[PDB]
Amino acid sequence: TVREWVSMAATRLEIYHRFKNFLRTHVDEHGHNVFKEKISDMCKENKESLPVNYEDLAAREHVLAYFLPEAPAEMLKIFDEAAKEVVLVMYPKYDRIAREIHVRISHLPLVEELRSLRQLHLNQLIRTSGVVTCCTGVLPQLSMVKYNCNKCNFILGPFFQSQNQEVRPGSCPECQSFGPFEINMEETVYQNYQRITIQESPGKVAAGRLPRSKDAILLADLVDSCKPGDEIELTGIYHNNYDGSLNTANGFPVFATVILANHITKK
């Protein structure tokens, strides 16, 4: 599995160094350093999102360009860390205006449709297109919850939360008060949340068939980048989420599917 190979510490360090070298040393057709200008424009307008084109990444690193579409989570995390390091080197004071630099992947060669997504595409970086039909408001979501212990008043460390399950607390050093654990509202970290709904294009839908739809999740800078009735090109991680209600309804164990959005382009 590519996930196991990229999970290796030495492989992780090698990928980190390669991405740092790619960011620092990537000349253009005229020799200009593209990422210097990109980071300058990003920090000049107080953004926290850095776009990366897949074509030049493949041109300068084919191994990573092959690893990315198969393990898009850890690879993107390493890319984010390397980008943050490069930005901090270039702009030492940017730790005030931002706390995490995100990497957005553009021009992914593979393009699919909402009607041809199967279990083969699970946990892979896919690229689809469609028309937005629903857009909920921006709600706050728990990012890193800081659980406390009533037995000792000491507060446990951060615990990351995913969009697929409910995070549970760990173990206190010596007084094992697993039960009496709560959450404080002044040390926890939150993040923006928005769940859009995309459907097939009016022109591209088969006459005999009916339009299909899939749910997408937008977080952090991605929120409020779409409005209902807009044609978009969505790149994200196809993700599988259990839904017992559908199981009971259909009478057969079935799971819901959602897309964790990573890059959105409006055409």
Instruction: State CA 137 to chain mean position distance.
Output: 19
* Burial state string for 8-30 with b = 16 or more CB within 10 A and e = fewer than 16: eeeebeebeebbbebbeebeeee
| Region binding another protein by CB under 8 A among candidate stretches 58-66, 113-121, 137-145, 197-205 | 137-145
Q: State the CB neighbour count (10 A cutoff) for residue 39.
A: 22
Distance CA 232, CA 133 (A): 11
From the list Zn ion, another protein, none, partner contacted by residue 10 (C-beta under 5 to 8 A by kind): another protein
Q: Which of 137, 202, 203, 208 binds another protein (CB under 8 A)?
A: 137
- The count of chain residues that interact with another protein, using the rule CB under 8 A, is 26
Q: How far is the CB of 172 from another protein (least distance, A)?
A: 11
Site for Zn ion in 159-178 (CB under 5 A): 172, 175
* 147 makes contact with Zn ion (CB under 5 A): no
Number of residues counted as binding Zn ion (CB under 5 A): 5
Q: Classify residue 128 by burial, with Cβ atoms within 10 Å: 0-12, 13-18, 19+.
A: buried
Displacement of CA 214 from its chain's centroid (Å): 17
Residues that bind Zn ion (CB under 5 A): 149, 151-152, 172, 175
| Sites of contact with another protein (CB under 8 A) | 7, 9-10, 13, 137, 139-142, 161, 163-166, 170-171, 173, 185-186, 190-193, 195, 224, 227
